[PDB]
């Protein structure tokens, strides 16, 4: 029953790789949690750059 619907969906679904490429998931070997913080570094560095 419910199981049948869930199955349907589960079959027609994207690979994490895809989702990353579409920007819904984080990478792709880069601490998924702690992504917030990675992105935060990234942004920092780039800032320090631009002010310099």
């Amino acid at each position: 029953e419910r199981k049948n619907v869930l199955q349907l969906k589960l079959q027609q679904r994207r690979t994490r790789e895809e989702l990353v490429s579409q920007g819904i998931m984080p990478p792709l070997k880069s601490p998924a949690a702690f992504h917030e913080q990675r992105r935060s570094l990234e942004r920092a560095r780039t800032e320090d750059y631009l002010k310099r």
Binding site: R2, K3, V5, L6, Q7, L10, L19, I24, E36
Partner: protein, 333 residues
């Protein structure tokens, strides 16, 4: 037939892939704290009990799916897989994230889950079956906490409740008489104006206590953690923030699919409260749907059951052969 084992901080839910509800549900006694296994010996014990005492099966004859918490360390699951294969010589096994299975039980593969049990609460946004780890929100306020709070403020009313057994009694009182107010201040006012909100509970020693505003002050913590001295935000705010950390394009998909799961979501009214608050926080053109199936205290387990029965799932099992070749690590892939 496969086994399904939802290893919680307070209750173990064990059963057979297929069934609508777990065959066995028993106290997790605490080897599990805040959703994480922290005593592998006592855990081995609990598992043994599960297989041999409650389920009456030979673990080597059944593929087994275990659940785990969001943010569970890979080392953790590796230890799980090992214990499963080496200590219990299971034929095959799979580990799944609780919130996810909850979502599955509702027939969805996308949406945000509020999973709140005895020892921990999580907001876990999920897209096409995958959790967005960066958007997960842990919150160390759950069932047990609300019980403790109830002991305290009940005492403040004049009733002594402090011993462990007294704690169990209070937990009963909680489950049977507590509820979430649509509006906390209004409810407090009503509670001041009459005795309509007052209810009675009989203790085992015959004596009969009366509980009033406590009935809803209690669960109110879930929305106002400050009540127990937590600097954190409430479940509504965390849901919201979690959504707001997700790729904006999928946020609508999230808002329209709030799935609530776990014992601590069983309070009458919580659903509506969450609807009111999220509505107040979310854009005014967004559709908000809060899904709270009556079955939900067991929805995680049910999710498992369903997942495990899907023919198409049988290709996902880590087999004893696969383990033999690759070692614990193989669970991660």
């Amino acid at each position: 037939t496969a086994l399904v084992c939802d290893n919680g901080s307070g209750l173990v839910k064990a059963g057979f892939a297929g069934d609508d509800a777990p065959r066995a549900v028993f106290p997790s006694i605490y080897p599990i704290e805040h959703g994480i296994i922290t005593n592998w010996d006592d855990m081995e014990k609990i598992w043994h009990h599960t297989f041999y005492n409650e389920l009456r099966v030979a673990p080597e004859e059944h593929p087994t799916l275990l659940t785990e918490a969001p943010l569970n360390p890979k080392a953790n699951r590796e230890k799980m897989t090992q214990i499963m294969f080496e200590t219990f010589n299971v034929p095959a096994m799979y580990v799944a994230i609780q919130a996810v299975l909850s979502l599955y039980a509702s027939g969805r593969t996308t949406g945000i889950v509020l999973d709140s049990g005895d020892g921990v609460t999580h907001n876990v946004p999920i897209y096409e079956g995958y959790a967005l780890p960066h958007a997960i929100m842990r919150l160390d306020l759950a069932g047990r906490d609300l019980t403790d709070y109830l002991m305290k403020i009940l005492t403040e009313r004049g009733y002594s409740f402090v011993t462990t057994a007294e704690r169990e009694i209070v937990r009963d009182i909680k489950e049977k008489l507590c509820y979430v107010a649509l509006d906390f201040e209004n409810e407090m006012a009503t509670a001041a104006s009459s005795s309509s909100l007052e209810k009675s509970y009989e203790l085992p020693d015959g004596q009969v206590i009366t509980i009033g505003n406590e009935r809803f002050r209690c669960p109110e913590t879930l929305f106002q953690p400050s009540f127990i001295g937590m600097e954190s935000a409430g479940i509504h705010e965390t849901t919201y923030n979690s959504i707001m950390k997700c790729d904006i394009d999928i946020r609508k998909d999230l808002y329209a699919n709030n799935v609530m799961s776990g014992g601590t979501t069983m309070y009458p009214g919580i659903a509506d409260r969450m609807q009111k608050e999220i509505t107040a926080l979310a854009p005014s053109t967004m559709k908000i749907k809060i899904i709270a199936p009556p079955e939900r205290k067991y929805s995680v387990w049910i999710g498992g059951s369903i997942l495990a029965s899907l023919s198409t799932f049988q290709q996902m099992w880590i087999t004893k052969q696969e383990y033999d070749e690759a070692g614990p690590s193989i669970v991660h892939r």
